[PDB]
């Protein structure tokens, strides 16, 4: 825990600076609104990315 | 030092995200090209802002 809290700091960055890239804004379900379907590695969508 | 390193993290943010607001780009000396004469609280120009 000597510098693990640091990651959590950076964690919040991601959402406040990138969460809108993975939001569910399309009503149809297909045709993503940001024109890119990739999930940035910063946003934790699966537990593996904790690594 | 339990979470003081955190500040240093945020410290680097400032420069990489705001240092250009306090750079010496004007050649004359008067006239700030960024139309801003204010100095961001993020950047440390004087030791007091360490607080
Ligand atoms: Ca300025």
From Swiss-Prot, chains A, B:
Coiled coil: none annotated. Ca(2+) binds at residues 21, 34, 36. It is found in: Mitochondrion; Nucleus. Homodimer. The 2-oxoglutarate dehydrogenase complex is composed of OGDH (2-oxoglutarate dehydrogenase; E1), DLST (dihydrolipoamide succinyltransferase; E2), DLD (dihydrolipoamide dehydrogenase; E3), and the assembly factor KGD4. It contains multiple copies of the three enzymatic components (E1, E2 and E3). In the nucleus, the 2-oxoglutarate dehydrogenase complex associates with KAT2A. Interacts with ABHD11; this interaction maintains the functional lipoylation of the 2-oxoglutarate dehydrogenase complex. The mitochondrial 2-oxoglutarate and 2-oxoadipate dehydrogenase complexes (OGDHC and OADHC, respectively) share their E2 (DLST) and E3 (dihydrolipoyl dehydrogenase or DLD) components, but the E1 component is specific to each complex (E1o and E1a (DHTK1), respectively). Belongs to the alpha-ketoglutarate dehydrogenase family. 2-oxoglutarate dehydrogenase (E1o) component of the 2-oxoglutarate dehydrogenase complex (OGDHC). Participates in the first step, rate limiting for the overall conversion of 2-oxoglutarate to succinyl-CoA and CO(2) catalyzed by the whole OGDHC. Catalyzes the irreversible decarboxylation of 2-oxoglutarate (alpha-ketoglutarate) via the thiamine diphosphate (ThDP) cofactor and subsequent transfer of the decarboxylated acyl intermediate on an oxidized dihydrolipoyl group that is covalently amidated to the E2 enzyme (dihydrolipoyllysine-residue succinyltransferase or DLST). This is 2-oxoglutarate dehydrogenase complex component E1. The gene is OGDH.
């Amino acid at each position: 825990l000597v510098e693990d809290h640091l990651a959590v700091q950076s964690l919040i960055r991601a959402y406040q600076i990138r969460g809108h890239h993975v939001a569910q804004l399309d009503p149809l379900g297909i045709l993503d609104a940001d024109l890119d379907s990739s999930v940035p590695a910063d946003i934790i969508s699966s537990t593996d990315k904790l690594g």
